[PDB]
Amino acid sequence: QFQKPGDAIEYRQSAFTLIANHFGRVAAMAQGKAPFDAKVAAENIALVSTLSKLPLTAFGPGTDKGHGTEAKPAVWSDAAGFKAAADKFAAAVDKLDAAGKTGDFAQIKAAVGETGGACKGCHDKFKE
Amino acid sequence: QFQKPGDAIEYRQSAFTLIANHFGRVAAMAQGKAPFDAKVAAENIALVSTLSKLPLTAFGPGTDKGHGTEAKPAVWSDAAGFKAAADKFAAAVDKLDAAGKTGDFAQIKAAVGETGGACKGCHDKFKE
Amino acid sequence: QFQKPGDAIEYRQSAFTLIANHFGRVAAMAQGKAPFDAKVAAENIALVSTLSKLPLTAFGPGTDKGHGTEAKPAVWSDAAGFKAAADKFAAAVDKLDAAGKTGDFAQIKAAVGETGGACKGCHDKFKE
Amino acid sequence: QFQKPGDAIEYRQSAFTLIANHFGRVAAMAQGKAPFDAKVAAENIALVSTLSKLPLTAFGPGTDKGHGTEAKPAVWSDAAGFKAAADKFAAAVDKLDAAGKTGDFAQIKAAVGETGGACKGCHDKFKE
């Protein structure tokens, strides 16, 4: 667990950073800005899948201020809304995980579009 | 990959932060500071193993300054030494991973001691 | 031996009290309620093993009443059943003792579950 | 350990009872009231040796009243005196343990005389 609040903040920020980087490699393939390689897309989606579970466990009470957090207070006051956004994200990643297993480009591109929306959706209401 | 150098620096710092947190949970169990659970020890060990590969790819040329990096210059001037320290870490992680597979407390405690030593070993020569 | 019946009753009650306390320390470790230590688990298991032989010699004829005994009459009328319950307990303790020797958490947890069952089993039919 | 004070009291009283009983079997041999048998004397002294360590760990703060304790307050207020008596007892039991190993009657009789005095010595100042 986290000894101090700052530990939680740093942990979640670190998780989102890793997720962003690996998810980005798959998105580049989907956008045609990088050659498509099923094995590599699979590896990266696998990483995103494993990491996606992590950051959401570090939003406990008391982790609201300090260590440069960009989490809006609404994360807590509207816990219901936050739970929903997290759920959408989880669902989308499941689709991305499956798509990754099949190696089908069209499916992967569709899943990254969905997942990406899940990131933005949550960010609009709870970040910055 | 990493568009800018700072991306690499933030990537590696975040990876270490996650590794530290999850390795710490296994460590606590092995040092008698928390109840032992083979499943949880196993899960945390899996995370460490997976993540251990990640940060070592983010030490390319030019990632020596900025983004509050704590990597000593020796990381580049003493490249061989660094690859030497990284190799030890890898071996230690392979043992920790094997221990996780067996669920054997003694084996796990032995491997966390070795891994810990590999962390500090590298840190002494290349960090801060 | 026991001069008076009461001596036998107090002897067996005291033995059970010590067994309960030391078995409980092993149990706590196995149920994830306390940090695991193979040496301490081993020591406590040794005590339980040694003491387990003791109380079963203090159930001779005439020790059925007085000194606040909680042994049901069935202990004597259903002698075979009692020897049956005691035999199971003994076997369970032999396994707990063997587990203590190996230091294997899984093996220990398995044996504490069996021993526990042997305690309650006998208690249901012959205690209170 | 002990969840409640009464647990400590019951534990130590139970330990002294077992000790008293087994020590008594050796004393009877030494007094010639029972035939001398080196093996049996050895077994019993071994039990006394193992058990002798136990009761002294259950005299913590707060275990002074209730559950029918016969421990005089001096046990705590004159902690120094209590520590001494316990030390004499420990030393005597060591002698009894050795004597038991040698199977020499004269040595055993001497050790039981010493140990017995250790019981009485401590009892006079700290019990009832």
Ligand code: HEM
């Ligand atoms: C979707 C896969 C996704 C991405 C991509 C993403 C990225 C991201 C980054 C890079 C950060 C910055 C980390 C840093 O400061 O170094 C960040 C921060 C937050 N995010 Fe995000 N994010 C994605 C998904 C989600 C989801 C689904 C939610 C909400 C359910 C969410 C929330 C947040 C919050 C809040 C932060 C700030 C955390 C903090 O600074 O304390 N993101 N995200």
Ligand code: HEM
């Ligand atoms: C071993 C399992 C291990 C742990 C644990 C560990 C932790 C760790 C942390 C927490 C950081 C701080 C990151 C931050 O500032 O947010 C960190 C940083 C560096 N480490 Fe380390 N580290 C472990 C292992 C290793 C090994 C085996 C090496 C070298 C081969 C190594 C190196 C470094 C370096 C350099 C940094 C600084 C990164 C930067 O700031 O740019 N670590 N480590």
Ligand code: HEM
């Ligand atoms: C198994 C390891 C086990 C435990 C633990 C256990 C505990 C226990 C306690 C604490 C008592 C109370 C003593 C007191 O009142 O001070 C107690 C009493 C009895 N038990 Fe028991 N017991 C364990 C095991 C067994 C087994 C396997 C049997 C039967 C074959 C058994 C029987 C009894 C009986 C009878 C009593 C009452 C003794 C009396 O009051 O005269 N127990 N037990």
Ligand code: HEM
């Ligand atoms: C020496 C081998 C020894 C014997 C024998 C002995 C016996 C004994 C008995 C039987 C009791 C009664 C237990 C009960 O209530 O059922 C008893 C109680 C106490 N003793 Fe004792 N005792 C022996 C040794 C020692 C030694 C060396 C000390 C002190 C250093 C000591 C102390 C006590 C105390 C105090 C009690 C009362 C505990 C309580 O009721 O809380 N004894 N002893």
